[PDB]
Design a protein around this nucleic acid. Structure first.
Ligand SMILES: Nc1nc2c(ncn2[C@H]2C[C@H](O)[C@@H](COP(=O)(O)OP(=O)(O)OP(=O)(O)O)O2)c(=O)[nH]1
Ligand SMILES: [Mg+2]
Ligand SMILES: [Mg+2]
Length: 374
DNA sequence: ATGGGTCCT
DNA sequence: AGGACCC
C-alpha cells in the first residue's frame, strides 16, 4: 500500500537557536563554533562563502566580518530539538528523529482521514502547498497525486505551527517513502517545501551526482563502490548484484541497490525517548591519569544533571593519538537517586583497563555514555 | 574533525 | 566492543 511521508529539515539549526537567543546576530553573518570548526552558519554567512564544517581559519579569511558563537554545549539545541519532535507528534504520533534537526512523519492515515471527509464536489478544489518537484503537471484524477497534495497541505500546517509556536523555520519534502521525502525536501531551501509526484522519481534520483549523496551510502561504502568503477546512480542500478553481494555482503548490496532505484520500504519508526545520552570532550593531549580523572568527572557532572528513567549501563570511550570503549553495568545501590565517588571509581577502573597508566599515553578524546535505560 | 545519535554483527 | 550509518 502506498504511503505519504514527510521529511522536515530545520534551516541552519544551531545558528537559528543562537539567533533566537541573541537577535543582535539576526542581521549579521553568524557561525557556530566547536573547537576549531564552524559547524554551521546562517544563510547570511553562506552567501559570503562560509561552509558547514569549515576551519575557523578558512571561514574568517573568506568572511573577516564573521561573528562566532560557541556551540560546544549542546544543551539548548537538544532542548529545542525535542520541542520540534513533540510538536510534530501532535499531528501524528509516529515521528522518527534523524539527528537533532530532522524528523520523518508517516502521514498516510491523516491523509486518508482528510480525504474521507471531503465531499466529492471538493476533490478538485485540492491544491498543492509549495513546490512540485520538476514543475510536474498535477493530475487531479490520479488518487496518488491527490494524496501527495493533501500531504503537502499537512506539511505546510506543520511548518506554520513550528514557526508560530517555536519561532523556527525549516524545509519539508513530501513523497512516497523516506528516502525520496529526504531527497526532495532539500530541493528548494531555506524555509520552503517540495512534493514529489511519482512520474518524477527517476528525475530526482538521477539528479544526484555522487553515490554518497544517497542516504544510507556513507564514507566507507562509497569508497568500496568507487574501487569497483561505480560512480553514478545509474552505474549502481545496473551493476551485477552477484558481484555487489560478494563485495559488500548480501545485506548492504541488496539494500543499496534498491536505494539506487529510489525504492525504500523502511517504516517510519516512533523514536520516543532517547536510547542513550553521552557527553564528549576533545583536546590536543591528555597525558595523565590525574588529568583524565578531572576530565571524566566534568563529563559525569553534566550527565548526572541530564539524568535527573535510569541508566543501567555506563561506558567510557577514548581516542588515542580510532575509538576504544569499555562498559559495565551500574550497581543497583548506585541506581537510586553522593553518587559521584563510586561512579568515578567505576569509570577509572574502566579507564585503567583500556589505558596502561604505567606506560606513557596520549588521548585526544574522552566520552562518557549512559545507556540501557529502564 | 566536532558533539552528538541510531542499529547491526 | 566494534562497525556502519545519520545529523
Ligand atoms: N559536530 C557536528 N555537528 C553536526 C554535523 N552535522 C550536523 N551537525 C549539527 C549542526 C547543525 O546545526 C545541524 C546540521 O544538520 P544539517 O545537516 O540539517 O545542517 P543545518 O541545519 O546546519 O543546515 P541546513 O540549512 O539544513 O542545510 O546539526 C557534524 O557532522 N558534526
Ligand atoms: Mg537542517
Ligand atoms: Mg541540523
Amino acid at each position: 500500500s502506498s504511503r505519504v511521508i514527510v521529511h522536515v529539515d530545520l534551516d541552519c539549526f544551531y545558528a537559528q537557536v543562537e539567533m533566537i537567543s541573541n537577535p543582535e546576530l539576526k542581521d549579521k553573518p553568524l557561525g557556530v563554533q566547536q573547537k576549531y570548526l564552524v559547524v554551521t552558519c546562517n544563510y547570511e554567512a553562506r552567501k559570503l562563502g562560509v561552509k558547514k564544517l569549515m576551519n575557523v581559519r578558512d571561514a574568517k579569511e573568506k568572511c573577516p566580518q564573521l561573528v562566532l558563537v560557541n556551540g560546544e554545549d549542546l544543551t539548548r539545541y537538544r532542548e529545542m530539538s525535542y520541542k520540534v519532535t513533540e510538536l510534530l507528534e501532535e499531528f501524528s504520533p509516529v515521528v522518527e528523529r534523524l539527528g537533532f534537526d530532522e524528523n520523518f512523519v508517516d502521514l498516510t492515515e491523516m491523509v486518508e482521514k482528510r480525504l474521507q471527509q471531503l465531499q466529492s464536489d471538493e476533490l478538485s478544489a485540492v491544491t498543492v502547498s509549495g513546490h512540485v518537484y520538476n514543475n510536474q503537471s498535477i493530475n487531479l484524477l490520479d488518487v496518488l497525486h491527490i494524496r501527495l497534495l493533501v500531504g503537502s497541505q499537512i506539511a505546510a500546517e506543520m511548518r506554520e505551527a513550528m514557526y508560530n509556536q517555536l519561532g523556527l523555520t525549516g524545509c519539508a519534502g513530501v513523497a512516497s517513502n523516506k528516502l525520496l521525502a529526504k531527497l526532495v525536501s532539500g530541493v528548494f531551501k531555506p524555509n520552503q517545501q517540495t512534493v514529489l509526484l511519482p512520474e518524477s522519481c527517476q528525475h530526482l534520483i538521477h539528479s544526484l551526482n555522487h553515490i554518497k549523496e544517497i542516504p544510507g551510502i556513507g564514507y566507507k561504502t562509497a569508497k568500496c563502490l568507487e574501487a569497483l568503477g561505480i560512480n553514478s546512480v545509474r552505474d549502481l542500478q545496473t551493476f551485477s548484484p552477484k558481484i555487489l553481494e560478494k563485495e559488500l555482503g548480501i545485506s548492504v548490496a541488496q539494500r543499496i541497490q534498491k536505494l539506487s532505484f529510489g525504492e525504500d520500504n523502511s517504516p517510519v519508526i516512533l523514536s520516543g525517548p532517547p536510547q542513550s545520552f553521552s557527553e564528549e570532550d576533545s583536546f590536543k593531549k591528555c597525558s595523565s591519569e590525574v588529568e583524565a580523572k578531572n576530565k571524566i568527572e566534568e563529563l559525569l557532572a553534566s550527565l548526572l544533571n541530564r539524568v535527573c528513567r535510569k541508566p543501567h549501563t555506563v561506558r567510557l570511550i577514548i581516542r588515542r593519538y580510532g575509538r576504544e570503549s569499555r562498559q559495565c553495568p551500574i550497581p543497583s545501590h548506585v541506581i537510586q537517586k553522593d553518587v559521584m565517588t563510586p561512579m568515578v571509581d567505576i569509570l577509572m577502573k574502566l579507564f585503567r583497563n583500556m589505558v596502561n597508566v604505567k606506560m606513557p599515553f596520549h588521548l585526544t578524546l574522552l566520552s562518557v555514555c549512559f545507556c540501557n535505560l529502564k
